[model samples]
Target: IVGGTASVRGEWPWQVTLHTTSPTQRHLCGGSIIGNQWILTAAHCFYGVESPKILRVYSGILNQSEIKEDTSFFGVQEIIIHDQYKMAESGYDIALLKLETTVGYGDSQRPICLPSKGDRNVIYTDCWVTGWGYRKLRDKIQNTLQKAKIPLVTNEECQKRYRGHKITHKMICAGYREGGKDACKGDSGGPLSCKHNEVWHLVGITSWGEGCAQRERPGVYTNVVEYVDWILEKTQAV
Candidate 1:
């Protein structure tokens, strides 16, 4: 799930829905397209828990469709989680999933723009998030993908609100102060985007939060800026 004022009533933009044969499985949350064969999702979503074979990535969907599954879905070829990370602590929670086939881009199926150096600082305070996650004080996750706008919060404010968590430079923070407007369960790994100069750039990866959407306790994200070097090194492109 993403957060922000703009997102409350709008539809989610560029989210992939991962469905399994079993209902007991936890659906993974991830970000927009980054490359021809690459998808950026939360590492913890799969981390030792999901096998690549059991997963299928569906793009350009408002909701998971039973009929369109075969045509719109892609097989998982590779899963690359950040080695420095551990899902137990929820640190360094980022991953690159290589699709077995390239995504077909059009009005509804296109790659999301990635932020360059220092873009997170710009996006964190001004951008929004979108996904199919739980809303604040709600017991169930939304069936439709939803969007939320997020304001960038200062490091000091992050520390104040998220007292025990280590709010590092490698992470970004933003959300509501009274707490209902933010990301929650099932939103992990989705994009935190801000429109800059008429283009949208991804700046955050939904990582953690204390509860769904608390006023001051907004969701925290994996800062994409610090990982540029590594992402480029591995993916071989910006």
Candidate 2:
């Protein structure tokens, strides 16, 4: 858990949240901040062409309720889905969002540092993911963002786990085989970051997972590495 660059003992990462169709229903998933005013979340988070006005991104959220002191809404301008992600094949389930304008960094609204080229442990190192998705299936819904700590799993390891399921190289897996902490249905497009140079490196973008926190059903994320060119090409901060 961290807050404002200092290792806050009981807090979680400060730069993540979701955009729900209705704040009470808890829908949509993605990560925002790190300047550029462009939010990098899952393409499926905004499935099918729809009205941007219907989307409301909840930020500064440690919880999910609109009335919560920690939550704030940032209406989405437009959604940019990766050209390749087929809803059926689930290939490139990645998307970038355009915030109305720049959000300055401070105590509670800080942005994460983007990963640079030549970085180590692009896979294999531990990464932190945050969301307010289901902690368990059929459980009471959350009114706040839940923080889960996960590690980056290797592609080969994922293949061994899938045993013929279509887990692509453009995706990465995390979580334990025995059902430990992991991302679920509503955590898509959120940040998968690793610590580097005393700052968090934005690594993967939340993509998909099988069950809600199920064992061997670890959440799969969009390989941000593969779309670096596309991401850079389409992103606009303000």
Candidate 3:
């Protein structure tokens, strides 16, 4: 995340890093734990994957190098990208990856709760985005996770900022009018988490944006609430 600060380990337990299992591993995206063996991420992240089964995952680690030092990487047994994601449609830029191994829910690793039906009517606050994405454009992805507090943006206001581009209901907006904080490359598929009743919920997925921390253009996210039904069905089917 750009325009953000270093986050303490386990501050956002659901945050995770996704990468390839090639000879040389690299961080490509972020994801959230939704179940013992389920991870929620953006469908676009599979763009470079030759085989999803080669995807390596790591959670409960704030430092990227921890994968080598202490915790080992997890494997993806199965992956399911949204069916109507990349075509003549509105939006479905979401996906789920089933971990070959189950995560032990602890202080450092936990599944975040999903929003309930009809939860959209409620206004949200205390929202934030966490990632190991570049602090600046064309820069290194951070060694430690970065986090930034974000204010929700109305669709009409977000549309005003993103003229000529479509801001569908499936997408949610967040950031300042004079942007300085946001998710960026390698942060895609991460959760835009918001505190609700002392617990955290996945409000959106890091889907897209105009640029990294650019003014007038806030970050665009796949509205998780809009796809709650689909998420439930997909998670169950797989």
Candidate 4:
């Protein structure tokens, strides 16, 4: 997350780092643990990727440099990218990954709750986004997870700001209007969550943006509420 502070371990237990080991190990995107064997991410993340075998999930670790025995790695058994997702316009950018093994829940590994069907449209005025994305356009992605508070912006306001872009119902916007902070490169597919009644709910998935932390350009995310049914259906079907 750009312009954010280092996050504490276990503070975001559901967060996972997506990567591959073939050729060389590298962090590709961020994801959220939705179930014991399911992870929520962006469909665009797997674009042009054929096999799921190369995909790997890293959980229970806060610092990438501190990889230890506590860190768990899982192979992606299957991928379910949204059928209607389009790369040209960037809509329906959600996906679910089935893990080869079930996740063992602990203080540093857990699944995050999704918004209930009834609470789908509930606008969260306060929320937070976390990731290991670059802190700036030219900076390297961080080794430690970073987090920042980003308030939700109404669709109407968001649309007005990005006139040329297509901000559909499947997308939500968040960040300050001044836009000095936001999710940047490597943060894609990460969770944009908010707390409701003391419980955290997944509201969105990092999708796209004009540029990192640009004025009047807040980060855009796939509206998880709008696809809650799809997510449930896909995860259950697998």
Q: What does the lDDT read for residue 149 in candidate 3?
A: 98
Q: What would the per-residue lDDT of candidate 3 be over residues 67-100, giving only the tens digit for each residue?
A: 7635577889888888888921246889999889
Q: What's the TM for model 2?
A: 0.82
TM for candidate 3 is 0.95
Model 2 spans > 4 angstroms off: 1-14, 21-27, 66-72, 120-124, 236-238
- Model 2 alpha-carbon miss at residue 61, Å: 2.3
- Number of colliding residue pairs in each model: 17, 8, 0, 0
User: All candidates' TM-scores?
Assistant: 0.86, 0.82, 0.95, 0.95
Clashing pairs in 2: 30-189, 36-237, 42-189, 62-145, 63-144, 63-145, 64-143, 64-144
Determine which window of 10 residues in candidate 1 has minimal summed lDDT. Answer: 2-11
Better candidate number, 1 or 4, judged by lDDT: 4
Once model 2 is optimally superposed onto the true structure by TM-score, how far is the C-alpha of residue 228 displaced, in angstroms?
Answer: 1.9
- Candidate 4 versus the native: TM-score? 0.95
Clash count, predicted structure 1: 17
Q: Whole-model lDDT for model 4 versus the true structure?
A: 0.88
